[PDB]
Amino acid sequence: MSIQEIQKEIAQIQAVIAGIQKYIYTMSIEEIQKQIAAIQCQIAAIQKQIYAMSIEEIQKQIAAIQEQILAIYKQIMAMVT
Amino acid sequence: IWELKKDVYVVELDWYPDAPGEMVVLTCDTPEEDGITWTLDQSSEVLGSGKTLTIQVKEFGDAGQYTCHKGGEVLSHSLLLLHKKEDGIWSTDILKDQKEPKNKTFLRCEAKNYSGRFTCWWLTTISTDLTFSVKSSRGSSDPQGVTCGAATLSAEREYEYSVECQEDSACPAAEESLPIEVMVDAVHKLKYENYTSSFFIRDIIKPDPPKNLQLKPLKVEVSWEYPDTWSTPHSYFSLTFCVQVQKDRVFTDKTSATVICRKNASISVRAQDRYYSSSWSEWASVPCS
Amino acid sequence: SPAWTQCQQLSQKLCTLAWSAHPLVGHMDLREEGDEETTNDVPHIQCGDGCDPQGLRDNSQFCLQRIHQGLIFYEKLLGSDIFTGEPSLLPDSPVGQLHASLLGLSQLLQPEGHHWETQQIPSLSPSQPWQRLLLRFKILRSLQAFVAVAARVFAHGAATLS
Numbered sequence: 373m374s375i376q377e378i379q380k381e382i383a384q385i386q387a388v389i390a391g392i393q394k395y396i397y398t399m400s401i402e403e404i405q406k407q408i409a410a411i412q413c414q415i416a417a418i419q420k421q422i423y424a425m426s427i428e429e430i431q432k433q434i435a436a437i438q439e440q441i442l443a444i445y446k447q448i449m450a451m452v453t
Numbered sequence: 454i455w456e457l458k459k460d461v462y463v464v465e466l467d468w469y470p471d472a473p474g475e476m477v478v479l480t481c482d483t484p485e486e487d488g489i490t491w492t493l494d495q496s497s498e499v500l501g502s503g504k505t506l507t508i509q510v511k512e513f514g515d516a517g518q519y520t521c522h523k524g525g526e527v528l529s530h531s532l533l534l535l536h537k538k539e540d541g542i543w544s545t546d547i548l549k550d551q552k553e554p555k556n557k558t559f560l561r562c563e564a565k566n567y568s569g570r571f572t573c574w575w576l577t578t579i580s581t582d583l584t585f586s587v588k589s590s591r592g593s594s595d596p597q598g599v600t601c602g603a604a605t606l607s608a609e610r611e612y613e614y615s616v617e618c619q620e621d622s623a624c625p626a627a628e629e630s631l632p633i634e635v636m637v638d639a640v641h642k643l644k645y646e647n648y649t650s651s652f653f654i655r656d657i658i659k660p661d662p663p664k665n666l667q668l669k670p671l672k673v674e675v676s677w678e679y680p681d682t683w684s685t686p687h688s689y690f691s692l693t694f695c696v697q698v699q700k701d702r703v704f705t706d707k708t709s710a711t712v713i714c715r716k717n718a719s720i721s722v723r724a725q726d727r728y729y730s731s732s733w734s735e736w737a738s739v740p741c742s
Numbered sequence: 743s744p745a746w747t748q749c750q751q752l753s754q755k756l757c758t759l760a761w762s763a764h765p766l767v768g769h770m771d772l773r774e775e776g777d778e779e780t781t782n783d784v785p786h787i788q789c790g791d792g793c794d795p796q797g798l799r800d801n802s803q804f805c806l807q808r809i810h811q812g813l814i815f816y817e818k819l820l821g822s823d824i825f826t827g828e829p830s831l832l833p834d835s836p837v838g839q840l841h842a843s844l845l846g847l848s849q850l851l852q853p854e855g856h857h858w859e860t861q862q863i864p865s866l867s868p869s870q871p872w873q874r875l876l877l878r879f880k881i882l883r884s885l886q887a888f889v890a891v892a893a894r895v896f897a898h899g900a901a902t903l904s
């Protein structure tokens with residue numbers, strides 16, 4: 373859809389993953405930390421497609437990355453409960 | 454084209470090599486209707502005749518001060534500035550991206566207290582024909598008044614500029630619900646750019662360092678005071694403190710602590726808002742012994 | 743009287759839990775264009791509500807009515823589908839302890855005889871899990887701002903009004 377919305381969504385993901393990562397510091401951890409880095413490594417690769425200026429495939433990937441993040445969040449919250 | 458201030462206009466341009474730019478129509482600001490000629494900047498070459506002048510704006514050679522005259526007398530002036538749009542993005546050539554706390558951070562602001570006063574600074578490498586203009590409000594749809602001073606050089610190391618602002622009707626104790634907006638116009642020659650920052654005062658708080666740090670020996674009692682600039686009453690605007698020997702650290706809400714001077718001497722104390730996680734002050738330090 | 747020293751301890755504890763109960767973002771993150779309009783429906787300790795030091799000396803009932811209102815509002819929110827829906831948080835979670843601290847403090851302010859409980863304007867929370875998650879961050883940082891003011895009020899009242 374819009375190019376502006378996609379970059380905003382990436383920024384939100386970047387902020388969110390930064391917050392979960394920092395929160396984990398205050399408290400399988402090694403497995404989750406490896407999974408986080410792989411998404412970021414993927415976020416960077418996706419970001420390069422953007423600075424070239426597919427769209428449909430990126431929107432599908434944002435939703436898929438969002439699904440991975442939600443799963444991580446649920447595990448972490450369960451670990452502190 | 455829109456009016457930036459009296460007799461000053463901004464022309465937005467999609468900026469790329471050989472771009473056709475934008476057509477503009479200037480109107481001489483006069484009641485008169487006959488015997489008018491137009492010039493640009495210092496040249497006396499008449500660019501056109503009549504009440505209005507049509508020009509194609511596509512590069513900086515087409516910008517500048519257009520003047521209409523009649524009977525040898527100047528009637529009015531119109532300064533045209535260019536705002537470059539590069540790939541759908543407005544240019545940010547003039548200010549340096551500080552990249553903290555995130556990308557595209559050009560302005561940094563700090564407050565020493567909840568008074569409603571704060572300071573903002575930005576950086577540029579450009580030394581030439583450079584003008585900044587600062588306006589501020591609280592809220593965008595229903596803006597509340599904020600008065601700022603002039604932006605001026607505060608350091609050279611890369612040139613740093615600073616400006617002072619103060620909310621007209623501040624409520625130090627209230628819970629802010631609308632952020633402060635800071636807006637900076639930047640003009641380099643005929644290149645116009647602008648910049649914005651949005652924040653709550655509470656998020657840019659950074660207290661001054663602890664005051665009057667003193668030591669009392671005991672058969673090493675540390676004491677200090679709140680900084681003069683911090684919000685009053687201290688019983689309301691409470692601070693918390695970090696005491697470090699240098700890591701050997703303790704945290705306290707008191708203005709005193711007892712420590713052991715092990716190493717060669719270093720003791721240091723810094724301060725933070727007790728109830729809201731904003732920035733730590735710079736350290737105050739006193740040598741042991 | 744409102745038992746200031748007990749309110750200081752519970753409101754101080756709220757500040758600790760408000761920052762520790764849940765992951766955080768930067769103060770400039772998750773900002774969006776509609777935030778300016780959305781803020782009006784949430785209650786705030788505003789200018790003139792009596793929670794400044796001078797207002798508390800004259801009549802603390804105004805401020806304490808407002809603080810109570812805000813605690814009830816955030817409680818209703820933390821118990822809503824925003825926090826209990828997918829991705830679900832358990833009642834024993836840190837946020838559940840934070841919810842309990844809001845409830846614990848609000849019970850203390852409501853005197854004898856006066857009734858300050860109202861009705862919520864619940865509206866309807868989001869339906870997509872990702873949008874629920876984003877709203878949790880925004881709500882909790884709004885709560886952080888509110889409880890900071892409350893903690894100052896109670897710290898000041900215990901020190902000067904007891």
Ligand SMILES: *[C@@H]1O[C@H](CO)[C@@H](O[C@@H]2O[C@H](CO)[C@@H](O[C@@H]3O[C@H](CO[C@H]4O[C@H](CO)[C@@H](O)[C@H](O)[C@@H]4O)[C@@H](O)[C@H](O[C@H]4O[C@H](CO)[C@@H](O)[C@H](O)[C@@H]4O)[C@@H]3O)[C@H](O)[C@H]2NC(C)=O)[C@H](O)[C@H]1NC(C)=O
Pocket residue numbers: 455456465536636647
């Ligand atoms: C930072 O940089 C950005 C990017 O350049 C600037 O954005 C521009 O800001 C100016 C001023 O805020 C905007 O100018 C406005 O243009 C409007 C025209 O809108 C349409 O409608 C009219 C008919 O109503 C058409 O004729 C026109 O062609 C447009 O299609 C004006 O309506 C605005 O108000 C003017 O007129 C009213 C009376 O009608 C007066 O009361 C006002 O004082 C004013 O004279 C205004 O002129 C411009 O549109 C913005 N850019 C874009 C792309 O939209 C920022 O302004 C700049 N800095 C700041 C601080 O904003």
